[PDB]
């Protein structure tokens, strides 16, 4: 009896959240349709069948997935659970070999997999009863990241499994995951180049790189130069959290598969472009790690710029991965480096109710830090398509809501309807929930009147990490940052980053839970952005 | 009044019960138990208002005109002292009974509106006269002037709205009779005349009739009604097209590849083939309604939101059309359905033997102006087809690069009946696996969110806007598009293709549509 009340109460709060994000102006009809979407979301789940949707090419050669730092935090929370989810869906070959590689000694190996790895398997994956069947593919290798001799032994271990493959293709494909700090990558790749390359008889090698790719142009070019003598770009897969989201991948399709959007994607129709990233959480007591990164290096240099490239890129000659990336780097060469006056920075303080402590109230943050936890800036693309178009990138910690979306405003509708209408908007939201809607003006369906009584109406339309790993198995480099793409990305931000490190610009304080500095919203308004709400 | 208050309710209840019972009693018992559980601007009140419905004894007035007037009062859109006068040819010595047994019978939703029905009929009076007697219109004017002077308001006089629910052969006499006997008082008041039935059958026939009414009423007083010009989605065409930059920038020949305006009905002529045989499907709906839609689609941006500014642009684009010719038209005539439920058109006894009247017609129009040059506009209408469907389908040119056969052409659909809908068909990638991104699917982008069209038309007439009313110049330019073709049809140069009822029509129709820039992918 006591258990009944919790479920009905837990459901309505989810129902309340949905009717507040979609904002349907016919209140009654939406809740009925939205409610039926989540009824099948929790129920109707069984553990009877595992349909492997793998291509005939994937089962031809043995596959080996090596996760370096398997005892680490990133491997246990995200890397291994995603491999489990991929396996649950039947996306791994039946004879996949997974090897955990770490420095740490582990006795009672099976206890560790069940007590450490299985512990972080998610409740949403808990409807999997074949977890024991999945762990059968996992083995543990204790070695150092600097020993070519250990890699020769690892190679003997992988070769044992590779030669035991019951398929036509010989050799074996090897996907290496570096769930490690960036200071180790050059050492592991040198060691992998000398000790654990794929067999000469057949098999490719691919390396996934996770942690930040430097902190400036020089740091990244030094790091990219360390790996060039070992791996080309068809082998290096620089991963990104957002590129795997379906709505971000769909931007290429919504823009270029449709003439309606194609014809207005220029300066002659587009008036203001905004790419916003909002989080409710602060630094959560680990502000010391963030003090050396800043909000710009964290999410604006890599993720938001990755988004901005997909919006402004020219038409690729084809849908091939590197053809798409070429246009991605080419538009990133049409940008001007961000300047000091085109940037407004912020740093969050304690909340009004005191629930969220300030950034400087953290003991791990150095005293007198000018590290930004908020930044809004305008970029300029100098080409025939985007000349004069404002591109606003915004990122902020401990703000009024967690919200990640694109909001494009089209050119002001030149007076056939006057003030009765406003600017058209195209919205692409990826977080908290996927949604893509267009805001246009229609007449109010009550009476004809003067036809000046109109209303703004929206035209709605409804895991990332694991899909990206699969693209790596599938060899889809479309959603991975390229070397030239990374260096030209860095050249946009480094002059400003150097000015930030020398103290030329300092963040404006703002209480947690607000939108941020008052000057930021003014700066956005001063750069072609207007709203009527 | 301890007896009249009981009797008035008892009379109001039973008169509602009679209207509803159409089938072969026990229903009156069920309805009583259902009814047992059932528990304006200052300018509008400045002058008296008088609504005259000519031809009240006709089918159109009793079924459609007066029931719609009831809805205007239910919505609270009529002034509290409005005076409605029913004018008809036949004398009926059933003064109060006729209002309850004939007019109320066709009122809708009598299970909630039967308590304001008695207050509505109190505004209705009946005048029996001839449509040709200046003396009678003098007597009618003397009845109206008494109520006008009995108005408790600052402004004197009164406004008079005349409705001609009559065949067109009676219009010239009634407008002449109004001009000599029942014009508004010299102290104040406007006059407006609503005209419904077809305005001739060609350019000349329409021209003779338009010349007949000019010596009696100008264009600010003549409100030529059109059923669809008041439709919510058709009225919305002007807003969605110009209030939004997204649509404005693609509304030309550079982005648009084919436009289709389709009107589909499942019923045949329903044993009334004799009346339709002399009209044809082109004059019935294609010359007036579909072209009224077509005018709103191809009009340029009006200089303002003023009514005549919009109608000027409505006329200006209809003058850029070339008259439809014989090779750009496929006609059809329906035969008995495959299920036998719908008898053939020639199976009607009221239809002449060997008749070539079209029950189906698709034709292409060419608009020669900068915005639409080369854009095919297909107008299609058909009786006794696979479904009742009335919509606009604009197909844009798909840029193949860089998606090729993985994408198709974007579509804009605006449906007004049977159900309101405005959606865009685009291709997005399938939200499954990333794969090659060539795995896409065509997804439609639907629009999310008193009512009836006829009622709104009357109000716009009461408000005096005239945006949604056919203009004199607009009518002449509309006919000159269709008249050369109708003459070739009336001379037998083109003959309809037989097709069984329930199908899409003749197979040659779909070929003609396919041969003019329109593609399907299913
Ligand atoms: O005018 P019709 O074709 O007889 O049908 C009723 C129509 O009347 C209109 O005025 C209504 O808005 C529509 O709901 C409907 O399409």
Author numbering:
A (entry chain A): 10 to 471, 482 to 552
B (entry chain B): 8 to 31, 37 to 51, 63 to 472, 480 to 552
Give the published text:
The housekeeping enzyme glucose 6-phosphate dehydrogenase (G6PD) (EC 1.1.1.49) is the first and rate-limiting enzyme of the PPP. It catalyzes the oxidation of glucose 6-phosphate (G6P) originating from glycolysis to 6-phospho-D-glucono-1,5-lactone (6PL), whereby the cofactor NADP+ is reduced to NADPH. In the present study, we describe the crystal structures of Leishmania donovani G6PD (LdG6PD), both native and complexed with one or both substrates.
We observed conformational changes compared to the apo structure due to G6P binding alone. Within the G6P binding pocket, this conformational change was mainly visible through Y251 and surrounding residues (H250-Y254). Significantly larger conformational changes than in the structures complexed with NADP(H) are observed after binding substrate G6P. Moreover, the angle between the “Rossmann-like” domain and the β + α domain is reduced when G6P is bound. Structural comparison of the monomers shows that regions I248–I260 (α9) and P481–F499 (α14) rearrange, with the main chain atoms shifting by about 1.5 Å and the Y251 side chain by about 3 Å. Remarkably in all structures, G6P is bound only in subunit B of the G6PD dimer, although subunits A and B are essentially similar (RMSD ~ 0.7 Å). However, in G6P-bound LdG6PD structures, the position of G6P that best explains the electron density is different from that of homologous G6PD structures. Compared to these structures, the G6P conformation is rotated by 180° and located in a cleft, formed by amino acids D482-A483, Q440, H250-Y251, and K254.
